[PDB]
Amino acid sequence: MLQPKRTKFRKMHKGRNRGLAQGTDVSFGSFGLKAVGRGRLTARQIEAARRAMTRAVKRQGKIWIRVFPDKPITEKPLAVRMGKGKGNVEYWVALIQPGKVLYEMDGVPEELAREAFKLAAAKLPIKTTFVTKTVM
Amino acid sequence: EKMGLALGRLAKEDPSFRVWTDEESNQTIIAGMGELHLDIIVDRMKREFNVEANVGKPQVAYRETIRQKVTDVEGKHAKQSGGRGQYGHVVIDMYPLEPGSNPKGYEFINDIKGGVIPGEYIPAVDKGIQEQLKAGPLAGYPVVDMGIRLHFGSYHDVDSSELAFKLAASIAFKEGFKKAKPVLLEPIMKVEVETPEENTGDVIGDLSRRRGMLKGQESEVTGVKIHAEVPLSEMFGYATQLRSLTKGRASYTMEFLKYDEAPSNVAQAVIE
Amino acid sequence: TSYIGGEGHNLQEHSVILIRGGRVKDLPGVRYHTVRGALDCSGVKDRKQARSKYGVKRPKA
Amino acid sequence: AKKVQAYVKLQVAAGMANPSPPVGPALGQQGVNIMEFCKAFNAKTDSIEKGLPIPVVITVYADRSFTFVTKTPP
Amino acid sequence: MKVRASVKKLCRNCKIVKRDGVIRVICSAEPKHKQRQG
RNA sequence: CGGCGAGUAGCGCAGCUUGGUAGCGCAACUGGUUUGGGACCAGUGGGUCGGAGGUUCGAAUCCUCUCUCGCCGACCA
RNA sequence: AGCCAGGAUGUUGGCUUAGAAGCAGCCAUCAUUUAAAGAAAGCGUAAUAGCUCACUGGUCGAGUCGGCCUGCGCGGAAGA
């Protein structure tokens, strides 16, 4: 499971999710899934969506995982009165904004990739579409 | 005592059903023509000879053999107390033998050259390994295909006796098992079925459902006979379970062929 | 416990026998015998000598 | 050898006459006798190459009469 | 049959209808494909 | 659950205080002794400090994060 | 879109030779005969056969087919 190995700090602020993401192009391959939503993907979902594709081709093509968690989420232990310190690190997530290219796939005809992304999306929360590499 | 009697004065009515008595488990095994044939007999004793014998289910054998080679396995028995001081040390290696049709799953070739273990002690370890083969380290079921070659060892002057090496062989023996990870062996049957023309197919899947590895179907004027391999566990009730498929028109027969390493689904289901 | 004299026994945990008198002196407990020519332990595999014991039919041939 | 009535794609080996193992109900599904088949098939098998992997077509009529066409190896 | 919020033509001969305004996927060849409420 | 005390050769304890070098007893192998063993006398090897990240010239040691394992108690309606 | 047709030759193509004959899959994913027909889209078999579709003939005779971006609706939608 992808996880930032050995970073600066363990717990970090709740933060905010404003604006538009940076990576909006299909950079590495030929086909890519762009996220038309605005939410927070978890590491669990990431690898899950990976399996749907890793299975969708069985062995052909190259898969690029654009995003990376980099955000630690905590949670208070069950039934503990509020207060008494900051939570305990549970799991990691990667913030998402619209117009972000998440999975970039190359090596297969537009057909299967179109089909492949239909499987990845069913595991991810936010609405996403399928976009292609264009010229400049 | 009167059940052994019960059959003897009921068997007279019909030779069609026969009588056994478990080779290894001392449980009587009833045989017959079908559920209808058997059903009334149960009452024939439950009333005529007063026998509420809890009508169980046919039983099993379930062999067990090693999965792979071993590496060093050695023996060592040292409890001195002065007067006895029995000290015997051996170092064997057993291997998964070739699965062959011969009943020689045991073969101990002596690799020792010189007096590291006295000649008058080969019989002891020889005696040793074979008896433990009736103590399959799951629950004590028939073990075979153990390629044993004794490599090196030692002994104690004046002292060393048969006691040391027969038992010390076993302690070494057990390691080869607790370290090369054996696994069960299930007996396998060759079952031939004559199915006219029409339910042939649907019969196969039933047999296929019984883990039955298909062998081949050969056609004749009336009835295609089928050669089939099936684990004996899946076999109970088959007759009726078959005639209900073939509308009571088929004829199956049973032949043993070989022993198979029982899979997970069946494997753990013996451990107790 | 009782004794079956002669390598002609064929029983395991069942199969009724007959009993006659006589211990064996070396087997702790055994104080009776079997009548070879009885229920579940008939004659000992065709012996011709003193076969009124080990009871096997003589050579009819 | 009319429209599809009574034939199949077989003849594993003409060199082995009356082939049981690999054939089985391949032709026996219809009710085709093997002893009768020895009659005609062997009649020209001796005349032609044998044992080559080669198919034959055997079409049976309604009165229990057949016909064949010996073919080309795959 | 089976009721779902998403009903798709499984077979080739699965058809779509709007009886009573309620979507149905009645078929003509096979029974199991008959589904609705989508 | 939080939270003060342990984690070291095959076994049990040292060494942590104030950082610089891993030890004692028994186990184990070897030899003597004896008719042989036990016992008893001599010699020797064995971990390199629960695992990970820091700080320093230097980390078994001083701090942090997890794990396994004990004790204290998780009370007042 | 309907109504009558066709829809084939080598080719059981290997292998695990038990068996995957257009139809479990692993590879090629052909060329011929053509008005056309894929060494195959689905149903059906142990493995075939049987039944259709792709594409192509004719008839009838006018528009028809599939995606893209949104407005506004249906379903998802069950409590004392």
Give every CB contact of residue A66 below 8 A, 6+ residues apart in sequence. Answer: A23, A32, A100, A101, A102, A103, A104
How far is it, in rounded angstroms, from Cα D25 to Cα D38?
16
Q: Name the residues in B73-92 having a C-beta closer than 7 Å to nucleic acid strand F.
A: 80-83, 85
8 A C-beta contact, residue B188 and residue B260: yes
Query: In sequence order, what DSSP letters do the residues of C5-54 get, joined into one string?
Result: -STT---SS-S----EE---SSSTT--EE--SSBTTB---SS--TTTTSS
Pull the structure tokens for residue A128: 């996403």
Nearest chain B Cα distance for residue C13, angstroms: 7
Q: Which residues, 6 or more positions from B159, have their beta carbon under 8 angstroms from its beta carbon?
A: B84, B85, B86, B87
Grouping H, G, I as helix, E, B as strand and the rest as coil, residue E33 is: helix
Cα A66 to Cα A106: distance, rounded to the nearest angstrom:
13
List Cα–Cα distances, B263 to B28, B135, B144, B260, C40, in angstroms: 28, 21, 18, 9, 42
Identify the CA nearest to E11 among candidates E21, E22, E35.
Answer: E35
D12 touches strand G (CB under 7 A): yes
Edge-first strand listing for the sheet containing B74-79: B74-79, B86-96, B146-153, B106-110
Specify the DSSP class assigned to residue B10: T
List protein-proximal bases of chain F (any atom < 7 A from a CB). Answer: 1-2, 36-38, 53, 66
**Residue B221 to chain D, least CA–CA distance (Å):** 6
Task: Walk across the sheet containing A31-35 and list its strands.
Answer: A62-65, A100-106, A31-35, A128-132
Tally Cβ neighbours within 10 Å of residue A104: 24
Range of the domain at D28: 1-71
Q: Tell the residue number behind the tokens 């049709």, with chain if given.
A: B101
Cα–Cα distance measured from residue A100 to residue A79, given in angstroms and rounded to the nearest whole number? 37
**Residue B8 CA: distances (Å) to CA of B2, B15, B216, C38, C43:** 9, 11, 42, 16, 22
Helix (H) or strand (E) holding D37: helix D34-45
Distance CA B108, CA B119 (A): 14
Give me the number of domains chain D comprises. 1
Tell me, letter by letter, the H, E, C secondary structure of B79-140. Answer: ECCCCCCEEEEEEEEEEECCCCCCCCCEEEEECCCCCCCCHHHHHHHHHHHHHHCCCCCCCC
For A86, the token pair is: 């900051």
Coil, strand or helix: which one is B159? coil
- B21 at the C interface (CB within 8 A)? yes
Q: How far apart are CA E8 and CA E36, in angstroms?
A: 9
Backbone angles phi, psi at B37, to 5 degrees: -60, -45
**CB-based contact A21:A98 (threshold 8 Å):** yes
Strands of A40-42's sheet, edge to edge? A40-42, A88-95, A71-75
Q: Cβ of D30 under 8 Å from any chain B Cβ?
A: no
| Residue pair A88/A74 in contact by the 8 Å Cβ criterion | yes
Nearest to D42 by CA among D63, D68, D21, D22: D68
Its sign, for the CA torsion D11, D12, D18, D20, is negative
Q: What is the distance in angstroms measured between the alpha-carbon CA of A73 and the sugar C1' of F75?
A: 33
Q: Measured between alpha carbons, how far is residue A41 from residues A46, A122, B115, E6 in Å? A: 7, 13, 73, 24
Helix axes A43-57, A110-123, angle to 10 degrees: 150
Q: In Å, how far are A125, E3, E15, E22 from E38, measured between CA atoms?
A: 21, 7, 13, 8
Helix (H) or strand (E) holding B256: strand B251-260
* Long-range CB contacts for residues C26-32, cutoff 8 Å, separation at least 24: C27/C1, C27/C3, C29/C1, C30/C1, C30/C2, C30/C3, C31/C1, C31/C2, C32/C2, C32/C3
A46 Cβ neighbours under 8 A, 6+ residues apart: A2, A65, A67, A69, A94
Resolution in A: 3.4
Rounded distance between C-alpha atoms, residue E27 and residue E30, angstroms: 6
CA distances from B204 to B192, B195, B201, B211, B260 (A): 11, 10, 5, 11, 21
**Contact criterion met (CB below 8 Å) for A101 and A36:** no
- Is D53's CB less than 7 Å from nucleic acid strand G? yes
Residue in the structure block whose two tokens are 């999975």: A103
The whole-angstrom separation of Cα A133 and Cα A107 is 13
> d(Cα B76, Cα B90) in Å, to the nearest integer?
7
Assigned token pair, A50: 């990976």
Q: Which fold has domain A21-136?
A: Aldehyde Oxidoreductase; domain 3 (3.90.1170)
* Rounded-to-integer distance, Cα B108 and Cα B130, Å: 10
Distance CA C47, CA C58 (A): 7
Please give the torsion angle defined by the CA atoms of residues B248, B253, B258 and B264, in that order, rounded to the nearest 10 degrees.
20
The gap from C-alpha B61 to its chain's centroid, in whole angstroms, comes to 4
The CA-atom distances, in angstroms, between A6 and each of A10, A14, B37, C38, D72 are: 9, 20, 75, 88, 71
Q: Under an 8 Å CB criterion, which residues of B touch D?
A: 197, 200, 216-221, 224
Tokens 């913030």, residue located: A95
The CATH number that applies at residue D8 is: 3.30.1550.10
| SS3 category, B222 | coil
B21 with C12: CB under 8 angstroms? yes
Written as six digits, the tokens of A85 are 């310190």
Structural tokens at position A90: 């549970």
**Cβ contacts (< 8 Å) between C15 and chain B: which residues?**
4
- Concatenating the DSSP letter of every residue in chain A gives -----S-S-S--------S--S--S--SSSEEEEE-S--EEEHHHHHHHHHHHHHHHSS-SEEEE-----EEEEEPPTT--S-SS--EEEEEEEE--TTEEEEEEESS-HHHHHHHHHHHHHHSSS-EEEEE----
Residue B41 per-residue DSSP state: H
In sequence order, the 6+-apart residues with CB closer than 8 A to the CB of B120 are none
Please, what is the angle between helix B122-132 and helix B162-180, to 10°?
A: 40
Q: What is the CA radius of gyration of chain B?
A: 25
Classify burial at A84, counting beta carbons within 10 Å of its beta carbon; exposed 0-12, middle 13-18, buried 19 or more.
exposed
Virtual torsion, Cα B169, B171, B173, B176, nearest 10 deg: -140
Residues 6 or more apart in contact with residue C33 via CB below 8 angstroms: C2, C3, C4, C5, C19, C20, C21, C22
Neighbouring C-alpha atoms within 13 Å toward the C-beta of C28: 0
Q: For residue B222, give the chain D residue with the closest CA.
A: D31
What type of residue is B194? E
Q: Give per-residue burial for A39-64: e unless 16+ CB within 10 Å, then b.
A: eebbbebbeebbebbeebbeeebebe
DSSP per-residue letters across B164-218: HHHHHHHHHHHHHHHHH--EEEEEEEEEEEEE-SSSHHHHHHHHHHTT-EEEEEE
Calpha distance B215→B65 (Å, rounded): 26
| Tokens describing residue B14 | 């019909």
Convert C24-51 to b/e letters by CB count within 10 Å (16 or more is b).
eeeeeeeeebbebbeeebbbbeebeeeb
Cα–Cα distances in Å, from A25 out to A21, A68, B67? 11, 17, 54
CA distance B128 to B171: 10
Spatial separation of the C-alpha atoms in residues D73 and D54, rounded to whole Å: 4
**Sequence-ordered list of residues with C-beta below 8 angstroms from that of D12, at least 6 positions apart, any chain:** D19, D22, D23, D53
- Asked how this structure was determined, the answer is cryo-EM
Q: Where are the domains of chain A?
A: 21-136
| Burial annotation B118-153 (CB, 10 A radius, 16+ → b, else e) | eeebeebbbebbeebeeebebeebbbbbbbbebebb
d(CA B204, CA B193): 10
Q: Amino acid identity, residue B81?
A: S
Torsion sign, CA atoms C7, C37, B22, B228: positive
Q: Quote the CA–CA distance of B63 and E38 in Å, as a whole number.
A: 55
CA distance E17 to E23: 6
> Would an 8 Å CB–CB cutoff place D20 in contact with chain B?
yes
Quote the CA–CA distance of C37 and C33 in Å, as a whole number.
12
How many angstroms separate the CA atoms of B70 and B13, rounded? 56
Contact B116, B154 (CB under 8 A): yes
Taking the Cβ of residue B25 and every Cβ of chain C, the question of whether any pair is shorter than 8 Å is answered with: no
